[PDB]
Write a protein that holds these residues in place. Structure first.
Motif, PDB file in Angstrom:
ATOM      1  N   UNK A   1      46.538 -30.328  99.895  1.00 50.90           N
ATOM      2  CA  UNK A   1      47.367 -29.972  98.874  1.00 50.90           C
ATOM      3  C   UNK A   1      46.543 -29.335  97.578  1.00 50.90           C
TER       4      UNK A   1
ATOM      5  N   UNK B   1      45.464 -48.173  97.161  1.00 53.24           N
ATOM      6  CA  UNK B   1      46.240 -49.292  97.929  1.00 53.24           C
ATOM      7  C   UNK B   1      46.551 -48.761  99.363  1.00 53.24           C
ATOM      8  N   UNK B   2      46.008 -47.618  99.499  1.00 52.12           N
ATOM      9  CA  UNK B   2      46.351 -46.823 100.821  1.00 52.12           C
ATOM     10  C   UNK B   2      45.892 -47.776 102.034  1.00 52.12           C
ATOM     11  N   UNK B   3      46.098 -47.103 103.181  1.00 52.86           N
ATOM     12  CA  UNK B   3      46.032 -48.123 104.323  1.00 52.86           C
ATOM     13  C   UNK B   3      44.969 -47.504 105.394  1.00 52.86           C
TER      14      UNK B   3
ATOM     15  N   UNK C   1      45.230 -34.349  89.327  1.00 52.98           N
ATOM     16  CA  UNK C   1      46.295 -33.358  90.253  1.00 52.98           C
ATOM     17  C   UNK C   1      46.826 -32.378  89.231  1.00 52.98           C
TER      18      UNK C   1
ATOM     19  N   UNK D   1      44.530 -45.921 107.877  1.00 54.40           N
ATOM     20  CA  UNK D   1      45.305 -44.953 108.847  1.00 54.40           C
ATOM     21  C   UNK D   1      44.220 -44.319 109.776  1.00 54.40           C
TER      22      UNK D   1
ATOM     23  N   UNK E   1      48.074 -35.158  86.307  1.00 55.40           N
ATOM     24  CA  UNK E   1      48.606 -36.518  86.409  1.00 55.40           C
ATOM     25  C   UNK E   1      47.199 -37.138  86.998  1.00 55.40           C
ATOM     26  N   UNK E   2      47.174 -38.290  86.857  1.00 52.40           N
ATOM     27  CA  UNK E   2      46.017 -39.289  87.484  1.00 52.40           C
ATOM     28  C   UNK E   2      46.440 -40.102  88.744  1.00 52.40           C
ATOM     29  N   UNK E   3      46.209 -40.132  89.721  1.00 47.82           N
ATOM     30  CA  UNK E   3      46.549 -40.804  91.158  1.00 47.82           C
ATOM     31  C   UNK E   3      45.921 -42.124  91.107  1.00 47.82           C
ATOM     32  N   UNK E   4      46.498 -43.332  90.966  1.00 49.90           N
ATOM     33  CA  UNK E   4      45.943 -44.581  90.922  1.00 49.90           C
ATOM     34  C   UNK E   4      46.308 -45.191  92.393  1.00 49.90           C
ATOM     35  N   UNK E   5      47.607 -44.996  92.680  1.00 47.42           N
ATOM     36  CA  UNK E   5      48.016 -45.395  93.939  1.00 47.42           C
ATOM     37  C   UNK E   5      47.310 -45.222  95.462  1.00 47.42           C
ATOM     38  N   UNK E   6      46.683 -44.134  95.767  1.00 49.25           N
ATOM     39  CA  UNK E   6      45.972 -43.899  97.054  1.00 49.25           C
ATOM     40  C   UNK E   6      45.003 -45.258  97.305  1.00 49.25           C
TER      41      UNK E   6
ATOM     42  N   UNK F   1      42.252 -40.064  91.060  1.00 47.98           N
ATOM     43  CA  UNK F   1      42.410 -38.464  91.475  1.00 47.98           C
ATOM     44  C   UNK F   1      43.230 -37.587  90.475  1.00 47.98           C
TER      45      UNK F   1
ATOM     46  N   UNK G   1      44.171 -40.554 102.676  1.00 38.73           N
ATOM     47  CA  UNK G   1      43.924 -40.017 101.337  1.00 38.73           C
ATOM     48  C   UNK G   1      43.727 -38.606 101.384  1.00 38.73           C
ATOM     49  N   UNK G   2      44.230 -38.042 102.478  1.00 40.02           N
ATOM     50  CA  UNK G   2      44.062 -36.421 102.695  1.00 40.02           C
ATOM     51  C   UNK G   2      44.521 -35.551 101.337  1.00 40.02           C
TER      52      UNK G   2
END
Ligand code: HEM
Ligand code: HEM
Ligand SMILES: COc1ccnc(CCc2nc3cccnc3[nH]2)c1
Ligand SMILES: COc1ccnc(CCc2nc3cccnc3[nH]2)c1
Ligand SMILES: C[C@H](O)[C@H](O)[C@H]1CNc2nc(N)[nH]c(=O)c2N1
Ligand SMILES: C[C@H](O)[C@H](O)[C@H]1CNc2nc(N)[nH]c(=O)c2N1
Lengths: 414, 414
Positions: free
Chosen positions: B30, B21-23, B5, B25, B14-19, B3, B26-27
């Motif tokens: 913002x 590996x989310x859980x 940002x 529970x 920036x490019x979000x890769x981490x999400x 994603x 990716x809102x």
């Protein structure tokens, strides 16, 4: 049916019906304690089918951390964990892993602004503890360690992990050090109007209300699983700052102060399928927390009024923006006072520039950084901060620090 | 995959890769312009299977509005709409319904803070328009109507509805009145650094750059479906305010001013399955918009620096909180200047108390009120506002005002 919504200021509540007529595009976000962010109680242990995977995961993440892996130790550890679980139905983390786990969890906190410090953390291993008196004792060492005569140090003390769930370790206070609030005869409210409820609880459990504007509430620990036991914090252990303005000298006349130590005591650390329902942690204050939130909110001290009066400002014309002027000065005080009395602190502006730096290192690092804009953006001077114009994704990773149902609401009194 | 940002300040990405590996529970939240909030282009008409239901819905909501219904007119209208659709493959709203639709859509705007006015709205029916010159003409009447010599009046002028989608009416400007920004030879940047891109576009379409710090950009209208035609706004039609401080008289020396008219020109009104890709609307400014966002942001005028200098404040110590002091005074200016020069305006504090009132009437009314906390909470003095401590749900209802892909990015030049 409907969603409840609280207004922490007026404490008022409303029930949202409309969202139901929503569209095929109900975002929460604006919620303080959402259930997606909580890890409540238990009756039985943690189903192995669950524990085992997560346990493995964590361990892989752990060994997959250190430069040039220890492939054998990785496998060896893997094996041992597996073996241990299928022998006791759970497993213990090494101290080095717990440490990793504590820093990671912190690092993964969507709502913490100083996460750039994530690597600097003191881990107190209190997992052997067994009684309330032992808790009370460890909390003290931590407090004393962290306070470090004003030069604050972030720490954490990890008590016993949750077993069955009917044997949970829980500090009943929202925070390690926090003034109490009584509701005076004359209908007024001395102290921290915020802790009204808990203060009562403290009385109800035998605490002697020194009825005052700054009474540091007693530790209310419950260990193993027993009822909570009340303990008073060693007045010597609590370092405070007396609020005085570098100009308006009538300011100290206000008779204001605040504790130097911000430590969250009711969060739950989850790591490798394990969870510790008690593990206080502390960092250091960010000015605007004390100056803006604690002193000005209508649900706390609410001093904004007369602080403007004593500035001449017209306290009858909102349009006059006195509030804006007042608050500003209050914050200059706190920053001054702390600064002066050599108690570590961070002004909201530098805080943000550093988080931004952090966020950036965090993406180049592991391509990502969970953040809750709402929480991260300072309560005042928002768009005057970098983070305000920084889009951010908020997501739950692991390890992680979950809120958890207030203990009194879920206890077994005998 | 990842994603993107943006950071509207530094315009960095920036490019979000981490999400990933989310859980479980990716809102987004913002995010400025999310796709869940946009209604882009088209090639073909609007599938009747879709149009028909929504068309009905709206009509029911519409007649289900007025006290003591007109059961017959409700049915009659229902029938006529149905009949009309199955005869032309679409349908026209009555003026009274459009009016309802415009006020509702506004009322349903999660990001508007003055929604308490939702009932006061001027509707200009420009649906018959056909040419760029006619647009340009209606935009003028609206501007003149709304400006009302400083005593501002919220209005909206609804151009032609989208038909096939290759015949769309689109104002290419983000807003009705907005200064232009050039990038000076010496590498600097005069005017509104924000509109750099669009200003160029204006040149590229034949606009004569009067290279200045406050040049009100030209209307860039495209009608029916033709290419956009450039038009200059009648200098007489644009009412501005010259910024002067009720104390620091060196303030006007700053050579500062701003337009009195806030009108959003690139939003899309969706109602009863119909959508109008051009329908400028205006309200009136909320101080902190001009004082905080427009003057201080690093991506706009960025004046914060010297405004503190001229206050003596140490512009070398963040911790000194000068910025906080500066901004405050800037806002007192704007509020003063406007106030003085009789141009309607609203200080962020009163704004909030009124929205809160609104929100409350809104729940008792239809049990609900869509709000985007992030956007609603003033850019400065947040926790000093009621809305800051007010949890709120953000959801998309209908009618509604959707953002929409920037026209140049999706056009057919010949
Ligand atoms: C570098 C020192 C630190 C600073 C300046 C700092 C600052 C902050 C601030 C300003 C907030 C939001 C305000 C609020 O909670 O109402 C926050 C939240 C939080 N911080 Fe920190 N922090 C620090 C260290 C830590 C550490 C060491 C941990 C965990 C070991 C931590 C965990 C958290 C968590 C979990 C939250 C969210 C609490 C909540 O949900 O209410 N922080 N921090
Ligand atoms: C009572 C006069 C009004 C005031 C004081 C007001 C104020 C505001 C403010 C402060 C914002 C957020 C700032 C920003 O957009 O960057 C906003 C957003 C918005 N307002 Fe208003 N508003 C008014 C009337 C209206 C009317 C009459 C409409 C529609 C007919 C409207 C539609 C919107 C929309 C759609 C947004 C969100 C714009 C966006 O996404 O950027 N407002 N308004
Ligand atoms: C863990 O490091 C930090 C540093 C700075 N700030 C905090 C916030 C904790 C906290 N939560 C609270 C809720 C109510 C009243 N005071 C509170 N303090 C935590
Ligand atoms: C519709 O009533 C209002 C009242 C007050 N404010 C607005 C915001 C519109 C707007 N969007 C903008 C984006 C960039 C620069 N200026 C802008 N103005 C709209
Ligand atoms: C990144 C973030 O979404 C962005 O800076 C938002 C925050 N809140 C805002 N709120 C209002 N009213 N207007 C804005 O332009 C913004 N910008
Ligand atoms: C209703 C709303 O969620 C609530 O007031 C939030 C907003 N942002 C916050 N941000 C921080 N850091 N701390 C808080 O307590 C809050 N309160």
């Amino acid at each position: 049916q409907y969603v409840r919504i609280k207004n922490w200021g007026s404490g008022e509540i409303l029930h949202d019906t409309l969202h139901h007529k929503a569209t095929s595009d109900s975002c929460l976000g604006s919620i303080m304690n959402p259930k997606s962010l909580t890890r409540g109680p238990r009756d039985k242990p943690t189903p192995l089918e669950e524990l085992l995977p997560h346990a493995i995961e964590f361990i892989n993440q752990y060994y997959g951390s250190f430069k040039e892996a220890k492939i054998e130790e990785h496998l060896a550890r893997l094996e041992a964990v597996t073996k241990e679980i299928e022998t006791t139905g759970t497993y213990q983390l090494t101290l080095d892993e717990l440490i990793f786990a504590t820093k990671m969890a912190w690092r993964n906190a969507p709502r913490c602004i100083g996460r750039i410090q994530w690597s600097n953390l003191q881990v107190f291993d209190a997992r052997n503890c067994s009684t309330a008196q032992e808790m009370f004792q460890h909390i003290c060492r931590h407090i004393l360690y962290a306070t470090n005569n004003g030069n604050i140090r972030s720490a954490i003390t990890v008590f016993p992990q949750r077993s069955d769930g009917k044997h949970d370790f829980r500090l009943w206070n929202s925070q390690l050090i926090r003034y109490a609030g009584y509701q005076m005869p004359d209908g007024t409210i001395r102290g921290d109007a915020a802790t009204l409820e808990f203060t009562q609880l403290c009385i109800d459990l035998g605490w002697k209300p020194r009825y005052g504007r700054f009474d540091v509430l007693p530790l209310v620990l419950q260990a193993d699983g027993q009822d909570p036991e009340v303990f008073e914090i060693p007045p010597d252990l609590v370092l405070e700052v007396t609020m005085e303005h570098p100009k308006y000298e009538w300011f100290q006349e206000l008779g204001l102060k605040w504790y130097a130590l911000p430590a969250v005591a009711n969060m739950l650390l989850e790591v490798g399928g394990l969870e510790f329902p008690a593990c206080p942690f502390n960092g250091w204050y960010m000015g605007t927390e004390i100056g803006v939130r604690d002193f000005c909110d209508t649900q706390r001290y609410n001093i904004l009024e007369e602080v403007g009066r004593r500035m001449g400002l017209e306290t009858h014309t909102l349009a006059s923006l006195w509030k804006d002027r007042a608050v500003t000065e209050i914050n200059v005080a706190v920053l001054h006072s702390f600064q002066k009395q050599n108690v570590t602190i961070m002004d909201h502006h530098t805080a943000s520039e550093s988080f931004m730096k952090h966020m950036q290192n965090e993406y180049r690092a592991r391509g990502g950084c969970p953040a809750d804009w709402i929480w991260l953006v300072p309560p005042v001077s928002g768009s005057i901060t970098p983070v305000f114009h920084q889009e951010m994704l908020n997501y739950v990773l692991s390890p992680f620090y979950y809120y958890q149902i207030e203990p009194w609401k879920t206890h077994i009194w005998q």
